[PDB]
Every structure is written in C-alpha cells, then in structure tokens.
Amino acid sequence: MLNYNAPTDGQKSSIDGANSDQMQTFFWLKKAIITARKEQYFMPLASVTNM
Amino acid sequence: PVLKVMFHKDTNVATVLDASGSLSDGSVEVGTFHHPDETYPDSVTIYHGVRDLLYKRSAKDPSQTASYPNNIINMQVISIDMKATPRLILGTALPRVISTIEGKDVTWHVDVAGGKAPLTYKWQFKANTVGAAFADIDSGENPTAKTATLINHAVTAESAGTYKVIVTDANGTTIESSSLLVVGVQEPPEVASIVAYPSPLALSVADDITDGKTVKFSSLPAGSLIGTLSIKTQPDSGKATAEISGNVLTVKPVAAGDTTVVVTNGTKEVTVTVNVTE
Amino acid sequence: PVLKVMFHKDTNVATVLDASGSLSDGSVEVGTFHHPDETYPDSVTIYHGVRDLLYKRSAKDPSQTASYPNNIINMQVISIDMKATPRLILGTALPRVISTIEGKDVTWHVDVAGGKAPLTYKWQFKANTVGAAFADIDSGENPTAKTATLINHAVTAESAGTYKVIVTDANGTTIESSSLLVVGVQEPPEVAS
Amino acid sequence: EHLSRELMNGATQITEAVLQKDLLAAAGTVLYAGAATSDATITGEGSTPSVVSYKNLMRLDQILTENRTPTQTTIITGSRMIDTKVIGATRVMYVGSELVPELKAMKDLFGNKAFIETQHYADAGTIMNGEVGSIDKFRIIQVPEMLHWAGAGAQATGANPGYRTSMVSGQEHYDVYPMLVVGDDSFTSIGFQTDGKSLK
Amino acid sequence: VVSYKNLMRLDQILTENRTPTQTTIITGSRMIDTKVIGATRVMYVGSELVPELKAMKDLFGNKAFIETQHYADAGTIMNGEVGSIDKFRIIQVPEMLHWA
C-alpha cells in the first residue's frame, strides 16, 4: 500500500525513494495574463504644424 | 497530540478521549495513537487509527491480543464516540507574499477553527538581514499584536521582512503560518520650491515688541527632502530681528515697520513678508 | 571582498588591489567594486567591474568625471594588472546525501583553491531533531575535525544529521558547503544460540 | 514579444502624460473654488471649504462667453420617449474620476438635482466617449488618467471632513484637482521629421 | 447599512479597475409610466436584503429602487431579477449564504 501523500512540502510518496523523486508536481497552462493599453484623450485634440 | 481509546465489549462502543482523561463505564484501555499523524497529517483520520488499534486485540477479551481469525475486524457494528478536543484547523491563512509601497497601511488577518476555548495569538517578525531570527513584536506598543488582526501603520524600507503568527490552544497545541512583506522604494523627487505656512502673508502681527513670530516651511513636491535652512538676515534690522532654529523660524519685531525675510536652503529661496503694527 | 582600482594615465594601466593597500607610482583612485557581485556571483568578473568604473571618469583627468564622449571607453589599450588576492573557490564539494548502514566508516573530503595562506577548517553538525542548531564538533576528541578530511567510526542512529564545513581565509573570507547523512537501522536478529 | 509590447505601452503612456502636464501648466483662465486666492490657500476646513459649486460653473461659463470662445456642441431637443428630459449644454469639460461623486451630489439654484445622466438624453442625442452626464452648460467627460497636484493645498488639521490628503515634509496637506476645459484652436503640436503625425 | 454612496463608491472602484461592463443601458419606450434605466453591472443579493433595498432613498430623498414592470417593455429581463438601483441590476438568489 503505497501512498501519494503530498510531494509538495516534502512528503515523498512511498514508491519514490532516495534516488527517485517526483519530476512533475503541477501543470502549466502556458497562457499568460496581460493588461491592455491605457486610453488616450488629450492626444486626439492636437493639431500638427510642420517644422 | 496523543489520544486514548477505550472499548466496551457489551455495547460495542469505542470511546476516544484525551490522555489525561479516564472513563469508569467499565471499558478497557486498548491503546493510544497520534491523531495528526507525523508522517501523513491529512491522509489518515481517527477511524483508521481506531481500526488499527482494534485489529490487535482479541474478540473474546479486549484486554488480550489474538491472531487474525480472532481479531476484531468488523467495523460496521462498532460505533466511535468522540470526547477529545477537536483538532486545531487553520481556516484561512495569510497571503504568501504582500507587496506595498512605503507609506501605506497593511493588515494581516488569520482565522482559526476548533481547539480548546480561550485561544491566544502571538505575532513575530524576522528582518531580511542575514542571520536574523524571529523577534516578538512588542504588544504594549502595538495593541493589535496580541489580537488575531495585526495592523501596522506607515510601513517603510525597514518594515520589510517575514511575519509569522502563532496560535496557542488551552492545552498548548500550536499551529503557525507565515507571511512575507515586500516594499518598493522610489528616489526623492528633488526640491522644486519651498513655501511658508502661517503665514504666507504678514506672518503674525502683534503690537508688543516682545512677541515673537513662529514660521514653518515645507517643500512642495510630496516626499521631497528639505535640507538645513539658512536665513539671510532681515534687512532693516532696526524694525525687526530674525533668528532660525532648525526648520522653525522666530522673528522678533523691534519697531513697527514692514520687513521682508528670505530663507534659503542653499539652492532655492522663499520670500517672507512681515507686517508689524504699533 | 571590496576591491580598489587605480589608473595610471600615461601608461594606460589599471591596477586592482585590496582596499587597505596603496600604490605610490602616481596613479589615482577611480572607485571601488565587489569582485564577487552579491546579486550575480558568477555572471560578472573583474573586467566588467573595471569597465563600469572607468566609464564614469574623464579621459583627460581621471580625477574628474565627464559625460559620454569624454570617457575612457576603449579597452584595447587599457591593461589590468591584478595585485589582489585570488577569490576563494570551492574546487570539490561534498556529496549532497550519503547513505550507509550503522557500524560503517564514513569519510567527507573537501578541496578549496585560492585565497591567502591558511585555510583553517572547522566542521559543524546539526541534530536531526526539531529545534536544533549547528554546533561545533569537539576538535579535542576528534583531531580530524580541524583538518579538511573528517572521519567517523561506527556511526549510529544518533550520528544521522547534516554536516557542514567552513573554510576561512587568512583575510577572513569564508566559503561553506553542507552534506546530509542518512543511516539505516534493522531489528535485532534475536538470540538463536 | 511581451518585452516589446510593454515597452511600447510605456512609451505611449509617457507621451500622453507629458502632453497633459504641458496643457495644465499653461492654463490661461484659472478659477479657485471657494474663498481661496492662491494655490496654497485651497483648503477643506472652515466656514467655506473650497469645493466646486454651481455658481462657480456659472462663472466659468460667463467668463468663457466673454472671451467669445466657440462652443463645441449644440443643445438637445426632446424625444418622444417617456421620462426623457432636454439638456442645454454646449461645452465639453474633462474631469478626473475623483470628483465625480462631488459633481453628482451637487445642488442647483432651487435645491434640486443639477446632474443629468446620459440615460435620459441618450435618445435624440449623441453620447461622446467617456461621457457620464451633463451639468448646467457643460458635458462632463471622465478621463481615467487625469493628473493632480498632491500636497499643494493648505495644511490639514484634525477637523478634516473627509477630503483626500497627502503627506508633505511630515505634515498632511490637501490635494488639488484640475477640472479642465479646452477651447477650439488654442494650441498646436510641433512635428519634426514626423511625416504629418503628432509623434513618431 | 448599505446606502447610495456605497453603491456609487463600488461602481467608481470597478470603473478604475477597468472591469468590463456586463449590460447596456435602456432608453425610453412609448408606453406611459415607463422610466429609463442605466445599470450596466449585475449584482447578486440574498432574500433578506430585498426589503432594505426597496426602502432605500437616494441623495435627495427620492425613491431609489426601480421595479421590473416599469422597464419590462423595451428591455430584456434576466432570470430572477427583482429591480435595479444606480449602476447595478439586482438579482435574487434563493440560496445566498451569510455569516452569522
């Protein structure tokens, strides 16, 4: 009767010993979270004069 | 904590109770076990421990022990009665990392369920400096340290570190949880200008010559550091006398005459108007 | 270890030496930098620190500071002469975990290269029980505790723990490494005869 | 790709902030609410706190009409839908998010609501981007990133009725907020090697 | 007790946070005794709070709560809705939980 226990926080399962350990302990979605660009309100009012 | 199990043969009821307590119903002491298992705190509950203790004892006499065919292996008939103090369980834990800029209030809240009765909360702080150990926060200076909620005002660069709370039961069982505070620091904006307050105009006007004015100065960009102020002597020294100590300015008018005082930190100036009435 | 840099304008030679040391050939001090960079110990060497220090000073007068086009930004002509003591490097590190049974000799060995003259060695042991701290191994009882190679005879259950060695330079700089020991125990065979 | 995107976002934000500070620093017609006559004198304690009021908006309107500045928008006549009210606002004023509750609570000459939500005159009218309502002759636009002077106000005592404060040289001081109005043909941008755009 | 200013503050915070808006506003209808509504967010409440919301008053003393039958025409009424106040549309959940 081997037990998974919790590989995170150091509780090794019985099956894995000294030479062995859990390679994988979580999953990574690879999709990040980003924030959009701030709106601009004073720039559109400007009119350009060439220099 | 160690728990004690007592089994009543006639009624098939197993009682779980604290090590100190005892029962006189006629049951016999089967064994003891640790309710939070050291190796597997969460995988194993009370029922498994009680069953493992009962597997050793004999069916004919609970006091004696026997092999497998004579074991107590049927858990359906057996009923477990709980009399021990419930295990201490942390309902909500502090966030792992808290990030804040200097000059903002931060608050930590923790909630503990179960346990004896009169719970005790005690907080500790460890600085990020090398070779530092947890130091108890002075409860007298900060009253909220003893309570579950810890409130700290106007954190600075030195307030960065690791905060850990200790919750103590009546029986002494302890569960702890830790939090980390990260503080970001910005450079001072640099001095743009200096202003004079009570008063920007005329300061304090008193007929009596003995009366001395009080002036306070500040640098407008918020968070800017103002240096040691230097006074350029009042011009018409006959009408008034000016002397500055630290940042506060004291002006004594000798005669009823309007004067102007300029105080400079070495880079920027402020022009102060003095009005004196006889 | 902080290092102090001196630059000689005429010969275009930069001399790196200890903070306390001084040079009288006529050079000037440009600044100070840490040879093992605290944030990046292995990413930055002496050359990068010297270049960053030279970027600030003026080409005409190393005493004064200048903006970009007047800096000392060409490193072909600049030569760096190292007079400071070499950095202390752990040539050989202890195994992370050593596994053995009770009653067997176990040996830890460590090598250190660089540094000044003596590399006084001190060993510490931390008990496996909770609330335990590193304590110095009695050198009087075990003479090998002073030397680099530490040996134990007939390890038992109490011998399990974490072992760390501290190597100290003559100047006071130190480098450390730690190892963990695990021991297996079996039940007594029982008296047959 | 993330590094480049964040770089460009920072660049755009910086340019807009620079434009806003240039516009604020060069305002011609400046009005101080309450009894204050200077930037420092503005305060939230006393008989007369320096908060915006209906008569101050009427003053700003009258001053602007005296300068013959052209109006930006036309009035709205009614629509046949029930519970729709007409509005007579002909100018556009930009305000930060902090002052919006103060504007919503404001009272008119007769003591009723001055603020009119965009919901009433959505029909038979065009609602601009960021519009939250209209008061008197102005239509209010809320810009998320409006700047302000922190600590420029008068010294804050313990009689604070609930206005925002900031710490300056160890003392708490009030904040000051722009409430800006921009007129037609007031300013132009200079474009150097820009190929007809304001910024390259 | 919740007031008008608390709801205004919550909407202000959610606007500063750049949280998206769930619903669009409703203009008027031809039918009489129908009033416009401009709530753009969805709020869930328990059954116990509904009388308190119905008794609420705005800054100037007028009635704050607007029932569904007023704006049933020219609008789509979501499931379980009971009304709408300010920027929020109030939804009644039978099994809402509370701390005691």
Added chain:
Amino acid sequence: PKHYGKTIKVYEYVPLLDDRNINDQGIDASGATIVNGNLYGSSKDIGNITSKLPLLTENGGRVNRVGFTRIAREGSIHKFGFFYEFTQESIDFDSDDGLM
C-alpha cells in the same frame, strides 16, 4: 491532465509603469544607478512626473535603463464524498414500494 500533481500555475506580466514592478535595473538621466527601475509607478502627481521624466541629450548613451517583472498564481483541487446504507427487511416489508 493526469499524472501531473494537483496544481495549476500561470504567469502574469505586470506593465512597465506599475507599482508591482520592483527591480534593480534603474539608471537615471544623469547616468547613475537608482533604486527604482520603473520611471514612476502609479503616482499621478505632476511633481513626480516632472522630476522623473526620461530626458535625452545631444550626445547620449547609457542614460535610461528599464526592467520588467512577472508574477505567478496557483490553485488546487480537493475530494468529496458520502454514502448511505440499508437492509433487506426494510425494502421487502415496507408498505410503500419504490422507496430506493
């Protein structure tokens, strides 16, 4: 997915100017290193913006450096369950069938 533990994590990329962007890459316009990598945080003060603008000069190099940061989130799963029991006499001798 199976065989990967009991956690899911992601990356969140903070903007350049956010307050959470704490790093050690800063170089101010004068050419000296500074504590804060981001030019100014979420500060909206005109004084700070004027003080900390990136200004380039005629002959400029190594004046304005910036840095970036990313943070991580996580969440886990749990297990639940319950059962019930009955006897044969209860099913057979009950007055009402179809109880189960």
